[PDB]
Amino acid sequence: MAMRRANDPQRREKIIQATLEAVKLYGIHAVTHRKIATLAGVPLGSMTYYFSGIDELLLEAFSSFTEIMSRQYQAFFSDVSDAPGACQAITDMIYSSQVATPDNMELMYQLYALASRKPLLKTVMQNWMQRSQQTLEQWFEPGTARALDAFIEGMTLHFVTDRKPLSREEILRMVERVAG
Template identity: 45%
Template sequence: MSPDASARGSRSGRRNDPERRERIISAALDVIAEAGVAGASHRRIADHAGVPLGSMTYYFAGIDEVLREAFTRFAVEQSTRFEERMSAASDRRSAQDAVVALIADEVMHDQRELVLSHELYTLAAREPVYRALTADWMRRSRAALERHFDPETARILDALIEGLTIHRALDDQPRDRAEVQLAVARIVS
């Protein structure tokens, strides 16, 4: 390689784009949120990411790898946010309030995350690799809850959170905060 090529960043003389792979993963999540897994193609994701179509096969072996990477990022981000919220709780009461806030302020109001969650659940129902991903997500959620609640209560709270996401997606009657507070209070009492 010539010294000039080295200085420019690659063997072809073009600068590397170290964030391109991450942009593709972010774009994949956006496309899935807009068009579902069925609408997530190499071309659509590349267009959304603003990268050449060839970048898709340069960074990923195929669309399945793009989807796995995207859903892995999504699940880790969700788990981390949940863990942070539960870690901030200083006692059982503040933990109960944190669960209510998580449900009422995040699960019930973020359409993008709702769609992404359900797209992931659909894949997990059919594909073991996605089932393992969602199982890990649930383990992390329960572990965060178990900082403040016994394992059985943590498992029931986790099921409530997941169940309410389904109701939020399908029910035309919105849930209000008071109803969520009552449900969580009944479970933790």
């Protein structure tokens, strides 16, 4: 019954992309095998034999999403070779508004919303934090690294939200305060 399943990579990848698509269309609370399968263009009967339940599918789909986010994250530090340059890169990450996009926000904050109800989704967030931490720890002590990532978490959102957000100058100064 482990050997009943076939694990097709084409079907799998379609189901994963349709899952993210379903989250956008319906909200994370409302996604189901049925909705996903319809978006995916696969038989509903198929779904059970790739992912046992909705949480495991959600896990795979969001893991795909945070993988992409982490590549973008690391890419901001491509030219960093000291602490002040690291601070500049973090300022870029916040000021560029390329992380906190409408599309990215819609997906990540739905992940965050449901993660206290769904342990697999909390695991996704925990893995994602650890990757960001490991990136920052190239240039910062672990406590400072965690402080910066929390600052980035908050400031990327607030920057695109506030009626009157901070200047890049203000952002760089605050980042430099946190770096110590």
